[PDB]
Amino acid sequence: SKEYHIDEEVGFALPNPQENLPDFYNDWMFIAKHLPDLIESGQLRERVEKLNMLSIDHLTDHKSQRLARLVLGCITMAYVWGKGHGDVRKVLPRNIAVPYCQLSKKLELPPILVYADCVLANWKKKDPNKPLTYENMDVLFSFRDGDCSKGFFLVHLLVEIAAASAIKVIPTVFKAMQMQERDTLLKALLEIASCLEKALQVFHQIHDHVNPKAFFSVLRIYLSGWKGNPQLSDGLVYEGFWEDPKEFAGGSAGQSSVFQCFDVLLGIQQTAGGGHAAQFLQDMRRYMPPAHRNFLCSLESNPSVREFVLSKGDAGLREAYDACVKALVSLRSYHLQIVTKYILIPASQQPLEAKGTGGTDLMNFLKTVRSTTEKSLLKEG
Numbered sequence: 338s339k340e341y342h343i344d345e346e347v348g349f350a351l352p353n354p355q356e357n358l359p360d361f362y363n364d365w366m367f368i369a370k371h372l373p374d375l376i377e378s379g380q381l382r383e384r385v386e387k388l389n390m391l392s393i394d395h396l397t398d399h400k401s402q403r404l405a406r407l408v409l410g411c412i413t414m415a416y417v418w419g420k421g422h423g424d425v426r427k428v429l430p431r432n433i434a435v436p437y438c439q440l441s442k443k444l445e446l447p448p449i450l451v452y453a454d455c456v457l458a459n460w461k462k463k464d465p466n467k468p469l470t471y472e473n474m475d476v477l478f479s480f481r482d483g484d485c486s487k488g489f490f491l492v493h494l495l496v497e498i499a500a501a502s503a504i505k506v507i508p509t510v511f512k513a514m515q516m517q518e519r520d521t522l523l524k525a526l527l528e529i530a531s532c533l534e535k536a537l538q539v540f541h542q543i544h545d546h547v548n549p550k551a552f553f554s555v556l557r558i559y560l561s562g563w564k565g566n567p568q569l570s571d572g573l574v575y576e577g578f579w580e581d582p583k584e585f586a587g588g589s590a591g592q593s594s595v596f597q598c599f600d601v602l603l604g605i606q607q608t609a610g611g612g613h614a615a616q617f618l619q620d621m622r623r624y625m626p627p628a629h630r631n632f633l634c635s636l637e638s639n640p641s642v643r644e645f646v647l648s649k650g651d652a653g654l655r656e657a658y659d660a661c662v663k664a665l666v667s668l669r670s671y672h673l674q675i676v677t678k679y680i681l682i683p684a685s686q687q688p689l690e691a692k693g694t695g696g697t698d699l700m701n702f703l704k705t706v707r708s709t710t711e712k713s714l715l716k717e718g
């Protein structure tokens with residue numbers, strides 16, 4: 338997975354990303370590192386507006402370009418939403434928007450904060466000699482003081498890392514199929530099941546580091562976007578770059594390649610059907626980095642693991658396949674419990690159906706997606 342850019346240890350996450358840019362972009366780095374203070378003051382909007390258009394040509398390598406997207410992404414969100422109380426801006430300055438739109442065109446991403454920015458690239462190791470764990474880790478950027486953005490983003494990253502153990506087994510599954518190696522295929526599927534079972538235990542940790550009320554009222558508005566959002570109904574206008582206001586979906590873990598990776602592997606056709614959920618999951622691949630878009634493409638091109646397993650009249654092999662599907666159902670069942678605690682209950686406390694940051698009708702969306710996953714269970718062969 339050299340051309341796919343999937344690490345053995347961290348999977349789809351960017352391994353050890355850059356913390357600081359070259360000196361030419363210190364105007365950017367100063368605004369982004371002090372977003373908690375500059376928003377609370379009410380002087381962030383002016384600070385962005387009175388700032389020269391710095392060009393993008395001095396960002397040499399990929400990790401520099403990704404850190405720039407993160408800086409420019411976080412800044413763009415804090416500008417548009419401002420204090421987050423309702424006073425918004427429907428126009429992004431030409432000095433910030435043009436180089437952001439150019440950098441985003443270079444990396445084949447939309448010019449808006451995505452999962453790849455604020456999770457996969459928004460982290461660091463405290464002590465490099467220690468292991469990957471919450472006490473040894475910290476994010477690079479936050480929005481406000483008491484938004485739980487450290488706990489929020491790192492819990493996602495921890496799941497991505499847990500999934501990396503499963504992702505690295507996928508080449509063995511296809512080799513074992515081509516080579517008609519039944520026992521290897523069985524062991525590989527049981528390993529993937531075990532890794533995805535373990536990723537559920539990493540999910541549990543979100544309660545310890547993320548407060549529901551701090552999440553729903555403070556952080557969630559900055560993660561929101563402008564695709565079918567009433568606050569910016571026709572979209573946001575990027576001054577100088579584009580002519581009309583352009584709609585782009587807000588960030589969400591739907592932009593993660595992990596869950597899509599295993600749905601495709603296991604023949605769970607989420608993106609098939611032409612419904613609103615299928616449409617969303619396919620549309621969110623635009624918001625994944627192009628190497629992972631390519632990985633998911635490569636995965637669909639391979640022979641079906643499901644078809645292979647069903648054809649063989651083999652209880653152990655079916656059971657192993659079923660365990661992977663059960664694991665994905667569990668994670669989604671637990672994800673709905675999280676959604677009850679972190680969206681549903683908090684929204685009932687503030688003074689027809691509820692919209693997610695990605696733009697989905699979330700309760701129907703999520704239960705459709707879970708139901709599709711449930712239907713793929715063999716139910717004792």
Ligand code: HEM
Binds near residue numbers: 496676699
């Ligand atoms: C406070 C925590 C969380 C909330 C409130 C939440 C909420 C949601 C919502 C509303 C959606 C629907 C898409 C949208 O409209 O944006 C969604 C989708 C999704 N979420 Fe989360 N989520 C949370 C944490 C997580 C975590 C930790 C993961 C870890 C992998 C995750 C994985 C997903 C995935 C993969 C989808 C796409 C649908 C699917 O494949 O089942 N979410 N989430």
Ligand SMILES: N[C@@H](Cc1c[nH]c2ccccc12)C(=O)O
Binds near residue numbers: 451680693
């Ligand atoms: N989609 C979630 C927000 C969210 C959850 N996990 C994320 C990861 C990255 C960006 C946004 C998110 C919501 O509507 O509340």
Ligand SMILES: [C-]#N
Binds near residue numbers: 588589590591
């Ligand atoms: C979760 N989006």
